[PDB]
Paper text:
GtmA consists of two domains, a larger ‘upper’ domain containing a Rossmann-fold involved in binding the co-substrate SAM and a smaller ‘lower’ domain that changes its relative position to the upper domain in the three crystal structures described here. apo-GtmA seems to be highly flexible, as indicated by the higher B-factors. Our data suggest that GtmA methylates dithiol gliotoxin by a non-processive mechanism.
The apo form crystallized in space group P62 with one chain in the asymmetric unit, whereas the complexes appeared in two different crystal forms belonging to space group P21 with two monomers as the asymmetric unit in both cases. In order to investigate possible structural rearrangements and gain mechanistic insights into this transformation, we structurally elucidated the GtmA-apo, GtmA–SAM and GtmA–SAH-bound structures. These structures revealed several flexible parts of the upper domain (α1, α4 and β3) which are not visible in the electron density of the apo structure. We investigated the possible relevance of the disulfide bridge by carrying out microscale thermophoresis (MST) to determine the affinity of GtmA for SAM under reducing and oxidizing conditions; however, the affinity of GtmA for SAM was similar in both cases.
Residue numbers in the entry: 23 to 85, 115 to 287
Write the structure that this text describes.
Amino acid sequence: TEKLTGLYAQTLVDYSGVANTSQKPLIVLDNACGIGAVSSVLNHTLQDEAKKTWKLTCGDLSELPDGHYTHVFVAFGFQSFPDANAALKECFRILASGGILASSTWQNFNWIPIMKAAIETIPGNLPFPTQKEFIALHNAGWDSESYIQSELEKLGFRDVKVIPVPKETSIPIDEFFEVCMMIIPYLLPKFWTEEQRESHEKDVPMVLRQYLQDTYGANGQVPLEAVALITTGLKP
């Protein structure tokens, strides 16, 4: 996964304005080290500061001082929080006046289509989430520019911008297969009867591997295409 989220790490740091802001000293939060675990771009940006008065904190919003930070980053965190609204309220609380929230969330990605295609090789017209069904399983709305803009503005953010950014990369079959099998076990309970699972669950790995080897060569690459929403907002 991390080859693609690393591309979005540069986008999110650039869109936030942190490298060029007049707010000094920089007091930054990287939620759950979501950027730092996949990219050095933010850490390296701070290292390049002439000042040396800046601070970066990595910690988790999902359980910080009031009015403290100049920048809060949430890289692909809002769709996974237990309580996305509570987390957003916390972002507003811990930002200083003039502080910027920058977040990335998923709007589209191609791994659900590829999995669906593999599954419609099984006999039985078996059900599988569509791309929108899958996104909406947790914290629905964070794939919608209009939803996000209103959620941020309700809480007092202004100059709110929500921009879709497509990125494309490629991943080896073996790695793409393993990402799939982290997701499959989580879905089938929600979309198949126990009758359908006992009947077909055990063969999913083989057909998936078979479809993947079928389609993208034997040691080939699988494309990873996505659209992420890049959200920025100002706390007045």
